[model samples]
Target: TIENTVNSVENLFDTYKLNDTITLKNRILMAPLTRCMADANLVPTDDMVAYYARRAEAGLIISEATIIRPDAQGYPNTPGIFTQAQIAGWRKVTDAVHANGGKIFVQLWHTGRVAHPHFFGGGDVLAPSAQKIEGSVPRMRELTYVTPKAVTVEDIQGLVRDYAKAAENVIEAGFDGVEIHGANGYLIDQFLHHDSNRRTDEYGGTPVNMSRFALEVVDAIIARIGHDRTGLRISPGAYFNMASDSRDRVVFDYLLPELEKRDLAFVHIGIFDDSIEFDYLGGTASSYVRAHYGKTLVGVGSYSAETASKAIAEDKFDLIAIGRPFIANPDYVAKVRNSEELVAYSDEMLASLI
Candidate 1:
């Protein structure tokens, strides 16, 4: 069934991408999802491995973003890399995937200001700009407006080291390498954007300074692993938690050239736009980024066979990341290759998430 699905996708998408045929690069990788599978200790368990193993068929699999330090966590039961138990738990998942001949990447995560005081270890929710975002934010419990605390310079430095430590554990957990979650207004993204980070220190302002934290993670992971194995995900216009007013070129100014210097595996960009003038996030799509990054690229946002193929043929992306399509149509890759129709998203789940 999966073979058929993938074959269909291959037909719709040109041959540049071997994974989804939808992209020119020919690799269809799976992006991370925020599913809570870890136990209280934030370690992977048998169940965690099964969940990931089930979705491991992609060319590469990026695990759901995980909090590297206790300070990195915001959601309950989500996995982490701070403790030995967590590493051990992830081992099971990695072992299973390796046995299946699959490759995986760990997306290092930190919730930052989206957290509530009650949710964290009673620690204050830190922010980049320290200017609280407006509107109510949702949580496992209830939604509420945030009162974020500005992170001290010392705290930012400490977090940098913490990310390095987390990268070391990412390998221990049996991942191919690591990816820093520097998008979606997370701790890393907060520090990058002018609106989120209002610091005068070395870690904020200008492109170089704004990229410090993300580069820190890349450097740390490379020190432990190698550059060929690392990755990072960026969302230019994602305002999930009151993050908006981003200058496209300004944001990319710090992001693109810096990532090019790192010489990592690839970058996964999340492109979300509700219109035609700003198609593919106004060129934030696979093709746009592929030109900017000078490396392999993977893109996400309502991907299908034809889109994936066109992207692949057009040299927009080397790999395409599937999210919603993979959920109901487990054989999305197969179906797309044959130009088969994709199943629409489940309205129930969509409503619940919205």
Candidate 2:
């Protein structure tokens, strides 16, 4: 399987014209992954610049979850983009990638209920509802999650503005575009799922109401940086740091159609394993999403080069975002193209950028 041939000329390495303006050299995308290796100020380091540049062969490189504001911080050493210093630090990274003839995007994130007070010198965790999940921060297990306050309407308005500002800053930071982190049990994810969201306001209750917050943020980002320059990641089937409900299906059903109408750059599936099935969805999350939404969809989660190539050939998704594989092999694209051996990935590898 490692030394596989393309069933058709249409394979993973094939060039994809994402839109009228952005034409990817190939369909391989380096997925956004948290490294937790930023400087004390949450600014990307010189080593991070080299880290990204090493994987510039990817058709598109999505930076790790970069917080939009101070309180959005949930983990230590994660990067932020709101500050001038952060933007300047990212500029060097983008310059490095560009020098290697690669394209990149910044992934905007807000932890919401997943936020820990320890990162903010003790502060209120914000969400659509005041529901609290029992867990401690990753690596820093001493800092546990607190009950998030149900964000007011005014808070919603401010968040919209903050997302827009972050998108503008992403462009200024010399990156290609922005991917709203609506997935993986973050702020937007908290609103999408039933367990974390128990409010009765316009931002909650019915499916339309629940999808409003996510849509508003998407529209605000698109307003600042055109539809072509914007992308979104969503987990329709609650997997990590959240629980699932049957009613949640209606939420994504309502939301996906709306996303299709927007014509954003792409919608990426945020899951670690595509094989995992949900009884409510009747199958895998990525398959369920591809069935409902008709657009440029990116498929990820524990897929090998042969499997991803086969999936692309099957038209399950347009783009393939490689995660751990990219982390292990900086020349992942070239190695695949030449059918060369790849360094097997391991959890210990996360300790270092290379």
Candidate 3:
């Protein structure tokens, strides 16, 4: 029975056309996982290039979350796209993947209040509100979280400009597209969730106002690039870096419809586990996103090939983003297609770029 289920993953290998410009070879996307293996200058290394090239069989490989600016760094060794050297480093990676016939998208990131002064040489951690999360950095436990500076309207404008500039840089670096990291309680996400955003300005306090920054960032990126070259990841249900508020539903209810109107490349659900249901949202993250943002939705989170294929066949989500399995198996797509066994993913594998 298990063999039969694995053999039925034929649909996963079908080509998917995201827009008139881009078409994937298959439905399996390599989800963006933060490896934190960049060089001291936050540049991708030679090893990183080889690492990605090996997995080029993936329908679309979403690179690890990359910071847009110096202040966006919260963890050590995560790559940046702002500097010339950084863009050059990523160029090698993109070039290598393309040579191997794989498509790649860079997931642009900003940590916001989660950022620490230690990484960027003592600057105020910027956020929509002064509220801080209760924790320390994951690996660098010595550094504790701090109350961030509530960004002013001018500061918000600068951040939006930087995001657009980053998208332009992504294109220069030879990426196929750019995925705005608006999910997982990061900078853009902080404005969407009420727990962290307490501003009374146009950027917060109401659903339309709260969704303003994200839409602005999206619009700005589209202006620099195009709607077809942009994708977005979002978390309607706050699970990471935020506490859930029942009222948060209204914000996404408004935001998703607006995103649908834009007709971007795709909208990915940002979550560690797709099965975790939110009472406020009425179902799992993927189901909730599928119901509202009905374009191309990328569903991810601990899914096996068999299950993911089933989900796609049932019209649950148009695409599947495999995370840990991609880390453990460089030939994950091949293995799934051939119905071969997969190497179980383990935390110890995170130590190096495999």
User: Best candidate per lDDT, number?
Assistant: 3
lDDT of 3 by residue, 1-354 (tens): 212344488899999999999999999999999999999999999999999999999999999999999999999999999999999999999999999999999999999999998999999999999999998999885899899999999999999999999999999999999999999999999999999989998998999999999999999999998999899999998988899898899999999999998899999989988877899999888998888877999999878899888888888899999999999999999898787999999999999788
Where does model 1 exceed 4 Å of error? 1-26, 135-139, 143-145, 246-248, 272-282, 285-288, 337-341, 347-354
Number of clashing residue pairs, candidate 2: 0
Winner on TM-score (1 vs 3): 3
- The TM-score between candidate 2 and the true structure equals 0.97
The lowest-lDDT stretch of 10 consecutive residues in candidate 3 is 1-10
Cα deviation at 23, candidate 3, in Å, is 0.3
The Cα error of candidate 2 at residue 217, in Å, is 0.4
lDDT of 2 by residue, 50-119 (tens): 9999899989999999999988999999999999999999999999999999999999999999888888
lDDT of 1 at 7: 32
TM-scores, all models, native as reference: 0.85, 0.97, 0.98
